[PDB]
C-alpha cells in the first residue's frame, strides 16, 4: 500500500534506524536499505526477489546482526528472521530440508523447512547463515530462487520467494601470502568465485564484503552491549552506569581487527558481568541499588 506519513519518514530513516543496532558497516546497511526502498516504492522486479545478498566478510563484524537488524526493522522482532543455519547441511542430501521429501518417502507430508516458512510469511528476511559451510550443491538448489523467485516444493507447490530478502552470510586471521603494501576485499570476492559456482554469483544482487570494525566503532559497540545487560537483564531494580574511562577500558581490551565485537563481548563477560554476577550472588551490590562501574586500572 501507499505509505503512511510515519512509514515514509521511517523508511528514509532506514539507514539511521538500522544503525541503532549495526555499528559501522555503512555500505552494508545502505545496500540492504535500498532493497527495501525498491520494494516499497513500487519498483520491485516482479520476477526477481526483493533482495539477494551475500554478506561476506570477517567473522563477528555484524553479518548475522544486520540480518537481525533488518528483520527487527521490518517486523518488530528478529525472531521473524527465517534463519536457515547452513552449517547443518554438510552433504548433498540435506537439501531435502530446504524443499522436503519427494513423493514416496518419509517426511513428504511436512514438505520442507524453508518453503513452508515462506508460504506463511512471503514477506520475510531469509537468512542463510554460513552458506560457505554448505555442500557445493545445497546452494545449487537456489538457482531459480534467485532469478525466477520461486522454489518448487517436494509436494509440488512453487512458493513465492519474490517478496523475500535473501541473505547469504558467508564467512571470509592475519596477513596473507607474500609482499603487499598496507595492512583485501578482492581476496574475499574472488574466494567466492572459487567456492561458489558463478551461476550463483550472477543471481546475487549485491555482494557486500564487510569492513574491519575500527576502534572508533568498538567504543560505540561497548555502549550497545552494556545496553543489553542493563534494562533487559537488570530489571532487578538495578541500574548499570559506566564511566567514560570504563567504556574506554572495555574498548581497549575488546579491540582486535581480525575478529571484531565478539572479543569485546567476551571482554564484557570477563570484566563486567561476571564480576557483577559475583556481586549479586554475594549481594555486595544487590536488587534495589544503582551499580556504577569505575575503571579498574
Amino acid at each position: 500500500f501507499k505509505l503512511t506519513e510515519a512509514e515514509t519518514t521511517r523508511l528514509l530513516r532506514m539507514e539511521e534506524e538500522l544503525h541503532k543496532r549495526i555499528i559501522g558497516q555503512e555500505d552494508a546497511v545502505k545496500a540492504v536499505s535500498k532493497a527495501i526502498r525498491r520494494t516499497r516504492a513500487g519498483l520491485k522486479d516482479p520476477k526477481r526477489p526483493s533482495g539477494s545478498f551475500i554478506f561476506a566478510g570477517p567473522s563477528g563484524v555484524g553479518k548475522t546482526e544486520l540480518s537481525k537488524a533488518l528483520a527487527n526493522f521490518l517486523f518488530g522482532d528478529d525472531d521473524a528472521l527465517i534463519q536457515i543455519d547452513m552449517g547443518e547441511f554438510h552433504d548433498r542430501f540435506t537439501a531435502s530440508r530446504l524443499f522436503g521429501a519427494p513423493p514416496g518417502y518419509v517426511g513428504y507430508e511436512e514438505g520442507g523447512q524453508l518453503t513452508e516458512k515462506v508460504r506463511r510469511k512471503p514477506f520475510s528476511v531469509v537468512l542463510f547463515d554460513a552458506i560457505e559451510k554448505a555442500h557445493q550443491e545445497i546452494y545449487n538448489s537456489l538457482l531459480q530462487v534467485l532469478e525466477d523467485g520461486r522454489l518448487t516444493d517436494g509436494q509440488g507447490r512453487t512458493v513465492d520467494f519474490k517478496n523475500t530478502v535473501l541473505i547469504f552470510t558467508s564467512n571470509l586471521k592475519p596477513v596473507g601470502l607474500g609482499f603487499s603494501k598496507g595492512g583485501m576485499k578482492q581476496k574475499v570476492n574472488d574466494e567466492l568465485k572459487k567456492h561458489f559456482r558463478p551461476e550463483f554469483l550472477n543471481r546475487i544482487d549485491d555482494i557486500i564484503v564487510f569492513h574491519q570494525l575500527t576502534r572508533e566503532e568498538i567504543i560505540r559497540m561497548v555502549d550497545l552491549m552494556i545496553s543489553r545487560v542493563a534494562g533487559q537483564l537488570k530489571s532487578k531494580d538495578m541500574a548499570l552506569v559506566l564511566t567514560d574511562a570504563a567504556k574506554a577500558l572495555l574498548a581497549k581490551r575488546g579491540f582486535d581487527p581480525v575478529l571484531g565485537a565478539r572479543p569485546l563481548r567476551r571482554t564484557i563477560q570477563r570484566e563486567i558481568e561476571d564480576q557483577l554476577s559475583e556481586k549479586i550472588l554475594f549481594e555486595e551490590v544487590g536488587p534495589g541499588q544503582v551499580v556504577t562501574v569505575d575503571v579498574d586500572n
Partner: peptide, 24 residues
C-alpha cells in the same frame, strides 16, 4: 560410505468404517 538409505515410506494401509444398509 555415503550410500544413502532411501526411507521409502509406504502409503497408509488403514481400516475403513462403514455406512450400513438398513433392513428390518
Amino acid at each position: 560410505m555415503k550410500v544413502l538409505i532411501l526411507a521409502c515410506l509406504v502409503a497408509l494401509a488403514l481400516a475403513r468404517e462403514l455406512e450400513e444398509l438398513n433392513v428390518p
